[PDB]
Each structure stands twice: as structure tokens, then as C-alpha cells.
Symmetry: C5
Subunit: 311 residues, 5 copies
Amino acid sequence: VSPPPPIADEPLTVNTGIYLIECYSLDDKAETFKVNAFLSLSWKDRRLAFDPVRSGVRVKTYEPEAIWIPEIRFVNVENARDADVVDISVSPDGTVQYLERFSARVLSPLDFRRYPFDSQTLHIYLIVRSVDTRNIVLAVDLEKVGKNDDVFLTGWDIESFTAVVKPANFALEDRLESKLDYQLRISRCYFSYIPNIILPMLFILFISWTAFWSTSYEANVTLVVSTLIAHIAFNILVETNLPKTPYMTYTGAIIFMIYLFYFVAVIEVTVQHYLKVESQPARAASITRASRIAFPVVFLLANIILAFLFF
Amino acid sequence: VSPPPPIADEPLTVNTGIYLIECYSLDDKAETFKVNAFLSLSWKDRRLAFDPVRSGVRVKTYEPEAIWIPEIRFVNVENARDADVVDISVSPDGTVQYLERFSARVLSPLDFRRYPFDSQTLHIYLIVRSVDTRNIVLAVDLEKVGKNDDVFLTGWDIESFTAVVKPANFALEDRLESKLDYQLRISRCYFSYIPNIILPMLFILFISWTAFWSTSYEANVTLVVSTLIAHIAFNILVETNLPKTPYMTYTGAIIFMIYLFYFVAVIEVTVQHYLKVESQPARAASITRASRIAFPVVFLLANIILAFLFF
Amino acid sequence: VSPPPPIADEPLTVNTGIYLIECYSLDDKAETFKVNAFLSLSWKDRRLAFDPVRSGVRVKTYEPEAIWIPEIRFVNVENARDADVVDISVSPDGTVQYLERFSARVLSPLDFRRYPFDSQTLHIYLIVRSVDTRNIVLAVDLEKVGKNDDVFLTGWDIESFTAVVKPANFALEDRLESKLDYQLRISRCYFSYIPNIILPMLFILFISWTAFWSTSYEANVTLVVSTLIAHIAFNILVETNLPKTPYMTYTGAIIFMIYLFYFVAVIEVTVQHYLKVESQPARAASITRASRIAFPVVFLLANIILAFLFF
Amino acid sequence: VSPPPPIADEPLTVNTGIYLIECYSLDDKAETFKVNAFLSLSWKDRRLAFDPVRSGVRVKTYEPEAIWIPEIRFVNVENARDADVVDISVSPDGTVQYLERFSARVLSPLDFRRYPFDSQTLHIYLIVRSVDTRNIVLAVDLEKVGKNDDVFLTGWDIESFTAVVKPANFALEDRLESKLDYQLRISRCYFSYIPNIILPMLFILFISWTAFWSTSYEANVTLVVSTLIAHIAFNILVETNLPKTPYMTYTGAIIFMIYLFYFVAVIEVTVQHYLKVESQPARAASITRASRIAFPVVFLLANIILAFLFF
Amino acid sequence: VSPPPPIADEPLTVNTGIYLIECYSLDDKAETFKVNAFLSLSWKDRRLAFDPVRSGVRVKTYEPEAIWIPEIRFVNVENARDADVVDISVSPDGTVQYLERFSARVLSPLDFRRYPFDSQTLHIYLIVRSVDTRNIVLAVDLEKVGKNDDVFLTGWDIESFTAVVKPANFALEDRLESKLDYQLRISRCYFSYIPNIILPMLFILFISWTAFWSTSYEANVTLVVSTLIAHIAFNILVETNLPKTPYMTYTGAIIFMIYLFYFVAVIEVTVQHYLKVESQPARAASITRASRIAFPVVFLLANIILAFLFF
């Protein structure tokens, strides 16, 4: 079987359509997600045309081996998909209606800079490579693009599944390739963020600041250094929840500024003590009492600096 | 091979039956479980009917390629199943008795809000897609739905394996699909919660409260801050046992309220000290002595608030 | 090829035999072990009988496709085995001697209640499903059941590999199945428990008890609370060695009772201090001095309670 | 099919070309990376030559089985690649144009001595083994060597993909092999190095040095030993980011020297105390005051020693 | 195709040869290593003999399916190898020269008692099972046994790859098997052990001993108990580097004895305090001053006891 010969000089249009049955295994670290879907392809091969009256039937069904079928592939997949052909139907004019169910692991890049208020745009790129006998381009049948309502990705909200209708047609290793962009949009979700990461990290930070209602260098050193251990040990506890990136994220910045407020708290505590033992308990107490409004306010305003920086 | 032609206008009934041989690899995080089972299918194709007298035999056995067999598929599977056909038997009337042994990884959503007293309902969804020549619906042979007695899922109690007999018949990409719901019910199980998570976490919390039988700001700061480290380090130790969810669970709420009781204990300790060094040891001692009934009672009642909130 | 017709009304005996070549990958968590072995099957198909004189040969060798061979399967495997047929030999009477080398991942349940003095019984269950034309039962050729001497499972002692000769014959989805139990016994092994888990955990516990040779509430609070952190951090260190079960184990009980001895030590320390600051240093000292024989003795006797409870 | 016979005594040239479609799964620990690419091969087999006029066609397409095709293999792969032949085209002169899409896991050694300013050179080694009837050598078509612009490796910058045009021709197990070196260059990237590993580790180190503005052996011991715990716990937190190597890295040296500055700080603190309690508070204070310029300066200069050692 | 008939009653010699191309993925825990190599086999099948003059060619090449080829297998592999036949060459006399490239995961037992100065002997065991028609033995072609110079195993030194030429011929399940031992000798390598495990663990241990230049029970308790936490937290940090074995290793013994020196340090500190508060500061100071030479010397000598015990 050859590809269908062209009527004029025109290339062959294949009408694509992905319907998401399941989506699962978004690996935030590997920048992958697994998907289980229908792929529908449709084109016109007039070599397969027939008379519905003389053949007796409205629709002819073939096996994949029997007829010509285009080699459609995914670009951004790890390995080629687990495909199973569901149905091949040819109408009287020669219009082939192909359908397969596939499952593929997909590499779409992720951006965690606004964690845990980030949203993502997952791509599924479909290509077809043209042949020597005829050129092939993809098109999108927008009625055959959708998703099951049961489609769930725990800890995200699946907003929308579409495709960009204009395919990207381009030359590669001396032949025309036609690429299509199918986009799954999603938006994050971590109702427990505040009680699982933020609130206990604010509490351990506030505990360090009770050293501004105290003058014991021995109690203060225990307060500030022991709660710094408590902070690091807590960061250890929530390490699994936080994104491990080579760049700075929003939650990551909050964390960093907290390590800074531990450093500045120690400076104060050391200064307050150096002034009191250096017989200036006037200036010593003036600083420690100022820190009690200075630290919380500077914290709140810097957090507004960050918030506004990222959003 | 086409599907069997209909006698009247009726659709084709396939009689389904899943018998669980093994169940294993419930991944609480990925919301999957692996299963190894028999799938039995049964329908009537009168094109395969024969005379037992003239054929000489009572039952004819075919190969899968030889005869028409419906394309049954699972909905909520990662990849299509590892199927091995066990037996195909056709009786004189044309009744096909199909049997295969499969193993599949399955995506059923899990709800840990009532951890570790949660129960689950694992779904295995069977579909069949109807064809142009004839409509197909699934039915359930409830005598062929069951499970091996050896079937174990460590840390759960396998309660029941059934199917919802009314199939869900619906149109999808222009054809009728017939869906079936097979439900594995399970219920959790963790005797170690009481002896592995709750009791040592109550002990480390109680240790923090011995600061209400003390007036040393230096001993008290060590008591409350060191036991807060002990709490976080313990939470680290039992991190593997606890469910890593984007939502708030019951055990997770207990944990959170404990981080709050550390914060409130520090407030008290700081206030008691601020009053004693501010020459009001009457009010200082009044508070610290009140906390000794206040803290434990508030704890017990809040835990009853939580308990009743979740149950 | 059909199954061999019966001489009388008798069912077909297949003579089984597993010889373990390697065993490896015991996953204590997943309750699996991998195995690499020979499976030998032997039955009589008199349709394959021949005259050694007229055929010219002593033994005829066939290909698997050529002759009838029973569908033997494992029950408690994740996926069906990686089988490679080694030899098929038919003697003049029609006795088929089949041999294959397989490797399979196996689900046998494990019991860690007596960790690290537990022993296990790993099952490999062989089934055969009878057919419409004839009934099939398994038998054990005990000369063809054994294990290579190199067979090693690091951290255990491979005691014995046998089979229970009486097969379990039973009806399943309307046909007779014949099941066989092959048992690999194993017994645990951990000299490092004493020098890796128990001894450093007794040392950190004893360190907490030097607070009975002291009256400083500040040193005592540091001793008991700091060593409790040391205990939890050590439990973290040996978390990989200890079994993560939903039930209580023997080592797990020892651990739990140690968390209790930290709680009781804190009670004492708090009471001793409350009596001394409440001007009763007679009773204060009486208790602290009694704890010095009370604690170690109660520990030793409770450990004998536990020991005897589990053994 | 034999290899094409030589015109003269010359060997057969195959023109190679790898175009990277995706690259992913760089395992820093295992020294692997996965890749998905096109491999293009081109040679002249004049046995396949044809007359475009009499054959009627400009280009003949064959199946892999039909014609002779060289066994090209990768050297440094774990398992042989997942190859799928995309197109085989023969022009009138007998020039075969082969194209396949493969995905392979690759073992290229990595050097982390200059972490996190290291750059890498990933190799993909192509071999062909010559045969008895004729010698085979690889050549590089540099226009067919390239990479997709979407090719991403999170936390690195993909600089360049080329091949060394001079193939390495050599005798192995009595035959000529022709090897080619395809090099993917990459350079590291951890913009957050300073902000997540270095800065909080300098802060916890500086906190230890506030013991030079103090004379309390009890506060100083808490300062230096508690911040040493904070250092180790932080190193635990950033363990995932740091490379696990059997050799010394640059970041690893910084870490090591920090453990040394904790040791030397303790020596000082112990000496300062030993002199003050040994009634020499002149020399005691002289040392502690000197450490306040000595420690930071020695640190800065040693870090310049290291920096210059590695770069 | 049957095996070649014997000329006399002699058995068939197959000449083996493994050439290591790559070696990788030594899993210290699972006692496996992956390997990628050439396997060369050579034997005489006179059924394949030909006249070079009449056939026209000097050497005939066959496909694996075409001719008889022995079932050579590995003993100590997890799954049977990923084999790809590279070349089959038959000379005029019937001498088959087979070559395949395989990759296999291999189970060779490892001994870490002298970690990190241990050396290993990795086995690759080749078997052939004799058949009913003829006996088969393996031989070693020592010119076809070697390794690529690029062969690397990070953190080890690949010393040598040979085979024991005398095959082990033996009866198994009623037939002769011929076994061969191919040995890869490797030796460990960890310069970072001294700068990653031993030195910071000696520093944290030395810090505990500054309590012999001090008489404050409160500072001493903080010194010894806080550095014991620091020791456990550090052991946590280097847990990944250290071998997780059921037996006692050399590095493991060093670790254990360090936990003992923490226990003995606490005993001293408790005794020194009990004597000073029990008004015997003569004996109290005598002990503490003796410990300053006793502890370091006993440490050094015990480490020489260990060193000499293991080596």
C-alpha cells in the first residue's frame, strides 16, 4: 500500500483528535506526566471509495495491515506509546476514520517559581513525516478534542484541554514534518500548605523572638539557636512537599529570608549582651525593646516585597 | 470476522466476570493498585453453532484469531493489561465461553481525610465500544465475580469484591460504549498508630507541660524548645507512616494543633517570666498554676472537637 | 493438538519438580522475592508413543508448538514468569519429559512479629486448570525437587526447599484446578542488631538515668530531654533496619517501652524538683535514690515480660 | 543479502548523523542520561542501482529485511536501543538513505570536582564491525548532526552537540571496528547555590563566632556545639543537592573546612576557659579578642586558597 | 535442526570468550552488577561444511534461525540476557564462529567486612546443558577473553578479567552440565572516606573530651550529650556512604566503639560530679585529669586492636 495519490498538487490533510480518558503520574521532579487517551485520525483515500448501493453496505471496516494508515508519532514522549487500534471505518467516498487508544509518558517542562500558586501548560506534540510520493499536514477536528469528566490529577485543578489549530510545518532531515500542539492546563492547589508548611514555620520563628522580652544571654542563646535547629529540622520534615529546583522559587525565598531573620536575631542578642556587660544597659535595652516592633514589621513588609515581586 | 448479526433489533450481551487471584502494590501516594485476575466473557455467536452429532464432538475449542471476540478494555488502567488467554470454548448453540488471566496497574482515587480509620472503594471499570454493524452492552454474571481467599493487602482488611450490575451505557466519539463498575472495598487497619504515632507524641507533648510545675526560665526554655525539637524529629521518624496529601487529614489536624500547643506554651512561659522579672509574681504564679488544668482540658476538648468534626 | 484421551476414567497426572538455581531480591516491604529455577513437568501422552526399533531412535525430541503441553501457571506471581524451554524429550511409551528455566517475582506474606528472630515460609504455588475433554491433577516427583548449594539470601539462612505432595484439588469458574505448595524456609539472622540497634539504644537510655545521681533540675532536664532527642535521632538512623509494619513487633515493643521510660524519668525529675523547691528534700531525695534500683530492675523485668510474651 | 562488493580494494563508507529530539533523565549518581533521537545512515550499494526510466519511479523504498543494512551499534549503552525504522530510500545510483528513531540509556562518566561550576562532555559512541567479505568505516555528515531547540536538561545549559569527524578505526576479536565520538556539552547552573547552600551555611558558621564577644563558658558551649548540630542538620537538608562522590569536590572541601573551623572554635573556647579559671584572664582575653579578626580573615584566605586550588 | 552427530563417541566442545565492553550499576545492597559484553562461541558442525571452490566463497554467513546454535546460558543472572547476534561465520570445514553482544544483571556476593579497603571477585558463570543425542562441554579460548580499557566502575579499580579454564562438568536433573567461571576482580577506593566520614567524626568525638578540662557539670552535660546528638546526626548524614549489612564491618566497629566512648565519657562526668558534691574533690580531680591521657591512649590502642583484628 502506497499513500493516496493527490488530485491536484495538494498535500494530504489528516484530521487529528485526542480525547483524554485518564491522566495520572505527574512527576514534578522528572517533568513528566502519564496519559491514557483516544487518538482519532481521519483522511481521504479515494482508492478505498465504494458504491453503497452495489456493495450493499453503508460503511466498510478494514484491519490496519489491509489499508494505508499514516505513521503519526509523539515528539516529547520518553518511549513510543502503548497503542491499540479500536476501530477503522471507511465511508463510500473513501474517508477513513481511524481510532486508537494509547498511553504515553510525556516530557513537558514545569515552572515552580510561584509555588504553591503556580499553574502549568502541559504539551502533547503530534508529528507526521511526509514521504517521497506525497506531502502530509495535520489538522485539528475540534469536535474530537476533549476530556473525560472523571480526569483527576491529585493536588491540581484540570482547567482545559485543547489544541492550537495552526500546525507548525517545517523541514527536517530533508523532508516536511507537520507538528501539532495539544495543551493541558492546570492550576495549583495546596489547601494544606498554610497549616503544613507556613504556620508551624511562623510559630518556630515567633518563638525565636521571645528573646526581645528577655535579658538572659543564656536563655536567649538557647531560644534563638535551639529554634534555628527546630527550623532546619522542620525544613527537613517538609522537604518532600517543597520543589527541589536549581532556581529560586517564591516559597524558597520566604525560607531564605527566615534564615536571615535568625542571623539578624543572633546579631541583636550578641549586641544587647555586649552593651549590658560593657556597662551601657541604657542602649542595650533601647535596641532590644525596638526589635520588638522592628522585627515583626520588617518581616511583614519584606513578605509584601516578596509577594509583590513574584505576583 | 464480523460481529454476530442480530436476530431482532437487539444489541449483543457479553456476560462479564472478574475473579481476583492476587492483589498487591497499593501505592497510597500514586493512587494505584496492581491486580492479577481471571476475566471471563460469554456471548452467543450463532454463526459458530454446530451439530454435536455430525461434528462428533460436544465442545469446539478455537484460537483467538480464528473467531470473533469483543474488544473489552479497562478504563482506569495505566497501560493495557498483560493478558494471557486461558480457554475459548464454543458449545453446540454458538455460546462462546472466553477466559483470560490478566495483570493490570489501576488508578482508583483514595481519601485519607479519616486516616487511619479510612476505608476505600477501588474501581475496575470495564468498557466495550459498539461497532457500525451492531451494538454491544456488558452484563454481570454474579457467580463469576469473586476473589481468592489468599488475597491480602498488608495493613488493610479486604471486605468485598462485587460489581454494580446496571452497566452505564453512553455515547462517545459517535458510538455507544457500555461501562461496568467492579468495586473492591477495603478498610484500614494500623494497630501501631496508637503504639507507633499517637502515644510517643503525647508523651513528648506532656513533657513540655512540666514547665507549669517550674519557675526557672532557663529550665523552662530548655523543656519547651527541646521538646518542640523532639516533636519535629519524631514527626520526621513517623513521616513514612503518615499520608502525604495536598488536603487536611484527621491525624494531620492532631499534629497541627500540637504545633499550636507548643506556640501557646512558649507564650505562657514568656509571660510568666515577664511578670516575675516585672515584679508581679502574684499574677505570674496565678497564670502558671491555671495553665496546669487549662492546657490539658483545652487539649482534651479540642481533640473532641476534631474527633466530632471528622466523625 | 488436544489433551491425551484417557485409558480408563482416570484424570491426567503431571509430575512437577522445581530446582532453585538462584534466589534473590527478598523485598521485606513488598512481601516479594525473586527466584530463578528449573521447572520439570512429566506426563504420559500415548498418542506420541513409538517403536524404538522401527523409528530407529531411543528418544524423540519435539518443539513446544509440535506437541500438546499443559498450561502450568503460578498463582502468587506478580506477572507470569520469564520462561525458556530447555528440553522436551518423549520416550517410546509416550512419556513426555519437559524442562524449562524460569524467573519470577513472587508474593509470599511475611511475619515480622518476632523481628529479628523471625523465620519465614515462602510459597511458590503451581496450578493447572483442567479442560472440557479431560481432568488434570499435579503430582510431586520428589527426586526433581531441590536447590543449588550456592543459593544465598544475604541476612538469612536458607534452611530447606520442599513441596507438600498432596495437591489441593478444587473447582474454580466451573472447572477443576490442581494447586501445589512449594515451600522455601528461611530463618533470620542479624548479628549487627546487638551491635547496630540494641547496645547504642541501651547506652543513650542509661545516660538518661545518671539524673538519679544528680539534684540540678537544669542539668537533669538537659540529661533526660537531650537524650530523648538522641533516642529519636538514633531511631531515625536505624529506621532502615527496622520493619515498617501496621502491627506490633518484638523490637518495636522494646522501642515503645523505651519511650515510656523517658516519660516516667521526666515525671520523677519533675517530682524530685517539685518536692525540693516545696521544702520536703527528705521525700525528694528518698524517691531519686529509690529510682536508682527501681528503674533498672523494672526495665530488666519488663524486658523479661516482653521476651516471654513473644517467645 | 551480502555486503556490497568493493569496486577496488576500498572499504565501505557509511555516513552517520544523530539528531537529538529529546534528552532527559541525566542521573548524576549512575553517570547516565537517556536520549531520544534520529539516526541517519547513508551508503552506496550498487547492487540496488536502477534505471529511473525503465523502473518508472525516481526512488525505490525497501523494508529492512529486503536489503542489506549495516549492523550499527552503540558502545556505551546499558541495553541496545529502542529503534523504529522511519524510512529507507534508494536513489537510481544505489545510494541507500536509512533513517530510524531510537531511545537509549547512555553511560558517560561525570566529573564533579568543580561542583557547582562543573561542565560535562557526554559521549555517544557509534561502532560498526567489519565483515569477512568487506571492511566498513563510519563517516560524519555534519549537516545531519544537530538537536531540537526544545531539548532541555533542567539545571544545565545544553551548549553543543557535535561529532569528532576522524573515526577511531581498530582491530577487535580479529576484525576491524570503526568507532565515532558524538559529544553533548553541557555546563552547570545552580543560581540558587549561593542562595540555598552557601549563605545559610555561612550564617550558622557566623553564629558560632559570636562566642568571641562573650566570656560565659556555658553560653559559649551552647553557641559552638548547638550551631555545629545546626550545621550537620543543614548539611542533611542539602544532602540531595550535593554530589555523592568517592573523591573530593570543591563544595565538599568548603564543607570540610567548615567542620574544621568548628573544631578550632571549640579548642579556643576550651583554652579561653582554661586560662580564666587558671587565673590568667589577661592571656585568656588576648586570645579571644584576637580570634575576632583571626578566624574571619583565615576563613576568607583559606577560601581563596581553595578557590585558586580548584580554578 | 538437531545438534551435530558425533564422529566417534566424543562430546561437543564449544569454545567460549567474553570481552567486557562496559561494566556499570554495581548495587552494593542487592549484590548485583550490570555488564555489557561480547560473547564468542565456536564449535564444529560438519553438516554445515562446504567446498570453497564450488560454493565460490571462502566463508558462509548464516542467520541464527537457519543453523543449530547451542543454548548457552548464565547461571547467576536475574533475568536471561539482552542478546543481539553480531556475526555468524562458517568456514569450509563446518567450524561455526558465533558472536553476540549481550547485557545482563548479575548476582555475585559481596564482602564488606574490610570496608572501605575491601576488594571483590565478581563471577559470571556460563552453563550449557547436554542433550539426549549428544554431550556438550565448554572450553576457554583465552585470546577471546579480555576487557575494553575504558571499562570503569566509579569508586573502584578494575584489576583483572579472566576465566578459570578447567570447566566444572556435573550431572543435574539426569543430564551433564558444563559450567565456566569468569572472574572480574575489583578493589575499593574512597579518598573521601577520610575526608567525608572519619575526620569529622573524630572532631565531634574530640569535642566531647574537652569536658576533662572543665568542672561545670552543667557545661559538661551539654558538651557530652550535645556532641552525642551531633555524632548520631552525622552518622545520619553519612548513612548513604556506609554499607547496610547484617554483619559487623570494620568501619561499623569504629562507629560502635565511638558510641561506647560516649557512654564511658558520661560515666566519668557523672562520677567526677558525684565525688565533688560528695566532698572528695581530691579523687574527683584525680580521675578527670587521668581521663585526659587515658581516653586518647585507650582510643588509639583499641583502634590498633580493631585494625589488627580486621587486617
